[PDB]
Write a protein that holds these residues in place. Structure first.
Motif, PDB file in Angstrom:
ATOM      1  N   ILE A  12       0.828  -1.204   0.000  1.00 19.25           N
ATOM      2  CA  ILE A  12       0.000   0.000   0.000  1.00 19.25           C
ATOM      3  C   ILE A  12       0.866   1.261   0.000  1.00 19.25           C
ATOM      4  O   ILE A  12       1.732   1.370   0.890  1.00 19.25           O
ATOM      5  N   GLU A  13       0.697   2.184  -0.951  1.00 21.30           N
ATOM      6  CA  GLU A  13       1.289   3.522  -0.890  1.00 21.30           C
ATOM      7  C   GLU A  13       0.480   4.461   0.020  1.00 21.30           C
ATOM      8  O   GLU A  13      -0.750   4.538  -0.012  1.00 21.30           O
ATOM      9  N   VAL A  14       1.249   5.272   0.788  1.00 19.18           N
ATOM     10  CA  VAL A  14       0.629   6.250   1.666  1.00 19.18           C
ATOM     11  C   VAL A  14       1.321   7.602   1.547  1.00 19.18           C
ATOM     12  O   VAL A  14       2.492   7.621   1.324  1.00 19.18           O
ATOM     13  N   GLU A  15       0.578   8.696   1.704  1.00 17.16           N
ATOM     14  CA  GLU A  15       1.227  10.016   1.755  1.00 17.16           C
ATOM     15  C   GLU A  15       2.062  10.113   3.040  1.00 17.16           C
ATOM     16  O   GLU A  15       1.589   9.830   4.147  1.00 17.16           O
ATOM     17  N   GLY A  16       3.314  10.416   2.775  1.00 17.51           N
ATOM     18  CA  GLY A  16       4.180  10.806   3.904  1.00 17.51           C
ATOM     19  C   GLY A  16       4.772   9.669   4.713  1.00 17.51           C
ATOM     20  O   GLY A  16       5.190   9.771   5.868  1.00 17.51           O
ATOM     21  N   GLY A  17       4.769   8.453   4.130  1.00 14.10           N
ATOM     22  CA  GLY A  17       5.435   7.297   4.702  1.00 14.10           C
ATOM     23  C   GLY A  17       5.860   6.332   3.616  1.00 14.10           C
ATOM     24  O   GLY A  17       5.463   6.460   2.467  1.00 14.10           O
ATOM     25  N   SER A  18       6.683   5.357   3.993  1.00 20.46           N
ATOM     26  CA  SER A  18       7.015   4.232   3.106  1.00 20.46           C
ATOM     27  C   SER A  18       5.790   3.331   2.808  1.00 20.46           C
ATOM     28  O   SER A  18       4.868   3.256   3.594  1.00 20.46           O
TER      29      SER A  18
END
Ligand code: NA
Lengths: 66, 66
Positions: free
Chosen positions: A18-24
């Motif tokens: 899963i891609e997330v804003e502001g994290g790996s």
């Protein structure tokens, strides 16, 4: 809890990231996916989820498809 | 035995989902599709099938295009 978008999910193996804003990117296993039906995700799918830390490192929990 | 129409099927990946009146959509893998031909489905195709429960949730079995 955070929103994210599936980057890749190997349906045969039952896991992906899963891609997330502001994290790996966050690993997700099919056993984390909630709700009705066969546990699967397509790339681009938006979800909400939480992160938990186990011996293998961080992974998604309580994954709910939007 | 259920009847439905294919809602979507990714031919490259070999899986999709069947819509059924009065129930949730049902995951279908290419290995469930019966018959001699290449194991594929088009959206809109009418199908008969059984629902099989399992560790990863319900999916179609014995899918016949008819
Ligand atoms: Na990111």
């Amino acid at each position: 809890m955070q929103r994210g978008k599936v980057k890749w999910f190997n349906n045969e193996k039952g896991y992906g990231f899963i891609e997330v804003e502001g994290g790996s990117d966050v690993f997700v296993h099919f056993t984390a996916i909630q709700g009705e039906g066969f546990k699967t995700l397509e790339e681009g799918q938006e979800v909400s989820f939480e992160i938990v830390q186990g011996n293998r490192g961080p992974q998604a929990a309580n994954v709910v498809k939007e």
